[PDB]
C-alpha cells in the first residue's frame, strides 16, 4: 500500500485508526500512530491487506506507537488533504497561536490553531500527560492521524478530545473544542526514527 498521513488502517480486524507519518528505522519502514490504537504485535491492515504490526507503544501516560511495515509498502512524505497532499518537510514544533491542520479517516483534513501545550487528558484508562491542544475538530477514528502546519512541519499524532454525542467535536464552536495530540519529537527520539520528507 502507499503509506500517506491520514489514511485508515484497522487493528486486528477490529478497531480503526489513522496513519500519522511515514518513518524509517535503519532499513525498516514504519509509520507513527497513537499508542491507544493497538498493542505490541497487533496486526495492521490497509484496504484489507496486512501491512505490518505494532512494534512498540506507550499508553496511557503518553499516547504513541510505531508499526513496522513489510518491505512491500511504499512510504511517502505526504499527508492526505481530500484528493490533494501536504508534503512533509520536517518537524519544527509550532508555538501556541500557530495555525495547524490534522488529517484522519473520520473528519478528513481540518485546521485551527494551537491553544495550549502540556495538557493532561484523564482517559478512562489513565492520564495522558504533555499533550498539545488545538481547536481543529476531530472524530472517533481520527486517532493516530497527522497534525501538520501548511508549511509541512509535522507536529504530532491525534490522541483524543471532547467528543460529543455525534462522535466528533465539529458541531460545537472552535472556542469550545479540545482536540489533543501527542508531540512527534519525543516519539522520534524515543524509537530512533527518522521522518520521511520530500
Amino acid at each position: 500500500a502507499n503509506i500517506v498521513g491520514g489514511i485508515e488502517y484497522s487493528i486486528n480486524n477490529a478497531s480503526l485508526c489513522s496513519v500519522g507519518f511515514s518513518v524509517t528505522r535503519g532499513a525498516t519502514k514504519g509509520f507513527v500512530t497513537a499508542g491507544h490504537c493497538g498493542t505490541v504485535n497487533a496486526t495492521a491492515r490497509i484496504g484489507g491487506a496486512v501491512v505490518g504490526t505494532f512494534a512498540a507503544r506507550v499508553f496511557p501516560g503518553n499516547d504513541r506507537a510505531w508499526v513496522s511495515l513489510t518491505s512491500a509498502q511504499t512510504l511517502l512524505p505526504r499527508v492526505a488533504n481530500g484528493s490533494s497532499f501536504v508534503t512533509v518537510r520536517g518537524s519544527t514544533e509550532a508555538a501556541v497561536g500557530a495555525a495547524v491542520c490534522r488529517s484522519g479517516r473520520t473528519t478528513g483534513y481540518q485546521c485551527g490553531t494551537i491553544t495550549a501545550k502540556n495538557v493532561t487528558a484523564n482517559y478512562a484508562e489513565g492520564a495522558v500527560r504533555g499533550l498539545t491542544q488545538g481547536n481543529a475538530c476531530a472524530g472517533r477514528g481520527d486517532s493516530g492521524g497527522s497534525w501538520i502546519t501548511s508549511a509541512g512541519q509535522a507536529q504530532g499524532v491525534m490522541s483524543g478530545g471532547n467528543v460529543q454525542s455525534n462522535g466528533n467535536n465539529c458541531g460545537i464552536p472552535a472556542s469550545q473544542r479540545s482536540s489533543l495530540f501527542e508531540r512527534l519529537q519525543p516519539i522520534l527520539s524515543q524509537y530512533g526514527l527518522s521522518l520521511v520528507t520530500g
Binding site: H36, G160, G161, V163, L180
Partner: peptide
C-alpha cells in the same frame, strides 16, 4: 475527553 476520550481517545479517538
Amino acid at each position: 475527553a476520550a481517545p479517538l
